[PDB]
Symmetry: D2
Subunit: 392 residues, 4 copies
């Protein structure tokens, strides 16, 4: 397979552009020119690109410099036909953000953070972005007493309400997606899982403008089931965006190519996204790859790794399709009663009164006999893996 | 120290009554008599007792026996002065619940689970319980293709809506607390964290009636910060109840005495619960110990371990108060700007327009000078710890 | 694909025989007769069976019963052609072993554990078993002050040394395999990893008679790389047996079918065992499956899962073979310099002085230039997954 | 409590000198001058300093430069009375080491790695160092097919045998300590735990010269019991050095101050090292703090955090002593039979033949009765914790 713009594969400028300076060593690669990055991505099939303000414009560029950069950027976008679906702001690199942006203990830092974001919203709106992604990487703590969480969530909410206001007033029409992460770089990060971020969003002034941008590895850093969490995000209708990558459980942030960590979970994720209700995908935003080319690689390895993300997604998609169209899989699903979960437990018009009255629901229920019937879940799981292995 | 009824220490009947039959070996202790349990716990200082229907009344007890049992139990309560703050239902032991109660693929099991709960609701109502705790231990899966999560959430919701309805109509006045857990016994349990459970409750028909019952060990099973998650729950006003115990990170469910796992996090948690605003506790519900006396112990070790839960909470409370009252701590708190997070980021009446007009928040802001100043967090953490060690 | 006796797949009687009584619920399956188990497994393609003394003969059977059971068992093996390659002893189920067998703090329990084992050694020898597997599931602790580790290691060694003495003297010719596990059932188990077990064995009196029996899920419970750990056991020549199963990182012991956990690692493992030096396998013992049919299944599901293990292993082998046989893989391997690690760092007869005199090894070495060339590892890995996926 | 030279606290130059440049942000502190560090460390009570070659002399310094730094360095040592008990080599920062030093797939880097190390050995020898620590941080892989583990161990061994030959010919009298780490910076690092490292070492040519340098946080990254691993290292007599710090389970490398992570295990660890065999410590080497002052701190914070390390150790030492001196603990120890483990299982001159003849060890053994007695481990643990809290 080959990707089409229909696939909606995007990459962050900072993925293919990571110079591979890790916590223990120097960069192994030279910087990638953003224009060059646009051309290369277009060429591999990406439909869009995303970036943090500071990825494009060096922190502290004068207006002439910044203006020049933006202009060339837009020219490259025009020429390749790539779009900018989302934009984001770097609130974690500069020493000033060492205790966070929106929730730094220092009031002046909080005011500055908001201004940095507003400035990025303007640039996003001008490039046509539809969503503003917010990754509060420095919002959190290494020690429990250093941060008042309640005060922190109030401050977080306070900054976000202002951003929605500004957008709505300017008629920018942006949506906002909060990106959860459990830890790294802070010992513990606020809004640690997709669950925590959805519950928070529900407390904003204009909740309908807010959703989440969950990332594969972030949920796997807590050993959570990524597909299962995505399923819940879809049930809430809060999956505004998605970051795809690979990770090997609880350890530092690996940012591997999507599919290179937990393959089986990658497989069920692609099944959930594409084999949505009514034939169609359950999700229609960008399929964003938020990964990093391993430090052992050079620029050839960088493009290889970019192509690997798309290949991995398309291969899994193919196998998910085949899986569902297999009459033996259907038979297994029927035997496992997967679809029976979709039928209400209560009959149409039945309330507690009638249920209470139904002797077959309690008084005459043979718990023991039902408890002895197998669900055939293992056999179903085996068919799924055989499809993934191209054995069926 | 000594526990008072005002401390509100409660224990589940299944805690001191755990016969220590684990996944790999037989019970090392004989069955605990419920009346004895009531007597024993009243003696150690508990103010209330909780139980699952099946802890008290053997599954499949005839009306006569059931009544018999309840009546004796009520005497014990009477005699002792213990109350039943919350009640719960066992939807995980009997083989019929191997795929869940409320979200079992099998529709007949779902109907049965509802009926089983309704009945405990009545008993609870009759015993004066104010909360119904729901632990969906078998709601989940071992294999991704075996459970439609979205359908399961719909069915979970459908069952809860009905319980609320019934409670309201019978005038039971119950509140409902969902207990999240990441895994064990299912490979992955639905509503894996406090966050996922709060997000869910928010989608119910009478959300004001639902909250959560987070457990120390459940959150630590995913290596999450328990204190920080409880802080978020209180922010949301969804801490209906709390289960206290100990755990040593991501491994099987250990159920150790509270403070026997992550000691630093038990300290910070007691601090958060008791050193609430207006001097007073941030939480006024039962401090329930949901733990297990280790298998190597006999009944002496059983009572020893029950008392240890109370001693641990009281010893930590004592140090948390001393911590807060220390002038040097007050000095560290100030240097760390912990309270500055409570002051709004914006001046009263300021909106994006005025913030954009402030050159000092961006254009003339010296991020470099601000980024060079330290927060003094390590010194603050060291003082907290010396207070915990009784070294100050 | 079809299994042959030369594949040497074995199953423990306790695998397919697990009644599914977990820590939270009652058994969902009836007991499996050992004889039926023998016919069933011979039937799905296994070449041998393994068992715990107590799996075959109920703890506390008189010699008449015991003898009767052994004779029937022997007939079954007889009629089916299945062998008993290894035997083990249950030193974890009975309450007496709550603090361990060989390392119980109680001296009487230690003497008893040894006797229990000596007897199982007699049975194993009579059945033709060649290896005695020892899984010290109860050796360890929940609390640090409860167990003197040093004393524990002396006592573990004392017992093992006697076992070797006995076998050697009765001429049983047995080999001993220690099975490492990090936790469950004890909070922490002694000799937690393949490394710790190997180091320990090196200290015995007849170390040549001792090795390890590492299990997939055991090493994954610590988020360790199973394949890499086996590679090290092979380098030391201590891989005497191997238990295969699946697990999803650090959580309770799942014991899923082999390959249903970390699929990518299951792949690299088959590759390591089968594509040994010179086409031939690097390992020659039994490929034992120590898994459990999920609690949600009935006997149909049980036989299904037994076959899933064999299937998984043969599908993976087929793909690992193809991977290595692929000229493009062979080319990527050359580019990544994988085989270059086999060339000694030093020239033949080169020592520190010749090395110190080689200016090209340091003085004239261009680290910057070498530092910039990529290893092409992403590409090589992408090739491996495409083979696994059957896309190549 | 104040530190003495007898306490033997040492710090690596790179601990206090860490500029806080992490994987996600710029450095928040300026460079620390080495002479300054020696002076500041002498002042807080450290008895020695350690360093990587590159921490002292910038990579690629000419000889004049290199020579001047050493001379200055030695003068500071001289003036303060501080010693250099161990030295190490940076085989992880420079890009040339992206695939490892001693086990790089590239043969020229391997040769270069050995030369860089021999050079550091000469300087260590000149400074009086007695141990060479080797942390193989870049040895491992991100992908299984990228690294031939067996060949990697051969090359690791080839290099170490050479280092030993050199030291021994020259009369340096060094001892070598391998430092294990499960991951970070590599996805999986070779010799991941203390056990893997000890087993490896037993395979070298002059094993008596090799041991390990385990680090608190490195074992905890795998959720292993650090005290228990140290106990096993002591039993093998391979504890040549120790790195102390704090960590909160499996997540990125935190490098907190000793005791700021798992406080309970920090306590049992100090009890193990100090309440040794006679009355005397079980370990006699340096107590090295390999930690990092949090990114949120300035140099005031740096010096505070250095002191905190020493303060945590001395406070725990004090409590460990008090614990063991308590008659109630002695009583709890007696009831738990801790000391009974130290008594051989067999009576003097008893072998399998005499054990087999003892009907009481099996035939007449009342296992049911023994299994019913408790060990009182919880009560013992509760006494330990109360000593820790200064509650007794
Ligand atoms: O782990 C870093 C995180 O994954 C980051 O890349 C965010 O996605 C970005 O700052 C918002 O788009
Ligand atoms: O881990 C089991 C869980 O913690 C359980 O004990 C519940 O809390 C109970 O079913 C509701 O009270
Ligand atoms: O986790 C249980 C363990 O894996 C067990 O099944 C052993 O392998 C057996 O006791 C020795 O063969
Ligand atoms: O994870 C960093 C590691 O702990 C390191 O600082 C080593 O100790 C050093 O390279 C050898 O001393
Ligand atoms: Co990320
Ligand atoms: Co991301
Ligand atoms: Co629990
Ligand atoms: Co609970
Ligand atoms: Co096992
Ligand atoms: Co096993
Ligand atoms: Co370290
Ligand atoms: Co270290």
């Amino acid at each position: 397979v080959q990707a089409t713009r229909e696939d909606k594969f995007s990459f962050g400028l900072w993925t293919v552009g990571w110079q591979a300076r890790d916590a223990f060593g120097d960069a192994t690669r030279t910087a990638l020119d953003p224009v060059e990055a646009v051309h290369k991505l277009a060429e591999i099939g990406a439909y869009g690109i995303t970036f943090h303000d500071d990825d494009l414009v060096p922190f502290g560029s004068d207006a002439q410099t910044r203006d020049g950069i933006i202009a060339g950027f837009k020219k490259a976008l025009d020429e390749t036909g790539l779009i900018v679906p989302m934009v984001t702001t770097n609130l974690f690199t500069h020493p000033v953000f060492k205790d966070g942006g929106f929730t730094s203990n220092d009031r002046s830092v909080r005011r500055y953070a908001i201004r940095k974001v507003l400035r990025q919203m303007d640039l996003g709106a001008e490039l046509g972005a539809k969503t503003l992604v917010l990754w509060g990487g420095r919002e959190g703590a290494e020690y429990d007493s250093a941060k008042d969480v309640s005060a922190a969530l109030d401050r977080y909410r306070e900054a976000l309400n202002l951003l929605a206001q500004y957008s709505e007033d300017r008629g920018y029409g942006l949506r906002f997606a909060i990106e959860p992460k459990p830890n790294e770089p802070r010992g513990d990060i606020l809004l640690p899982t997709a669950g925590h971020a959805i519950a928070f969003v529900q407390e904003l002034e204009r909740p309908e403008l807010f959703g989440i941008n969950p990332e594969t590895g972030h949920e796997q850093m807590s050993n959570l089931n990524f597909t299962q969490g995505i399923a819940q995000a879809l049930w809430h209708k809060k999956l505004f965006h998605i970051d795809l990558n690979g990770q090997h459980g609880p350890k530092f942030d690996q940012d591997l190519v999507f599919g290179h960590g937990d393959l089986l979970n990658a497989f069920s994720l692609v099944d959930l996204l594409e084999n949505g209700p009514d034939g169609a995908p359950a999700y229609d935003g960008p399929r964003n790859f938020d990964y990093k080319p391993s430090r052992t690689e050079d620029y050839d390895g960088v493009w290889e790794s970019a192509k690997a993300n798309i290949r991995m997604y398309l291969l899994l998609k193919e196998r998910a399709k085949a899986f569902r169209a297999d009459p033996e899989v259907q038979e297994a699903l029927a035997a496992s009663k997967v679809a029976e979960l979709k039928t209400p437990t209560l009959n149409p018009g039945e309330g507690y009164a009638e249920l209470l009255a139904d002797r077959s629901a309690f008084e005459d229920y043979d718990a023991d006999a039902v408890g002895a019937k197998g669900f055939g879940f293992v056999k179903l799981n085996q068919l799924a893996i055989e499809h993934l292995l191209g054995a069926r």
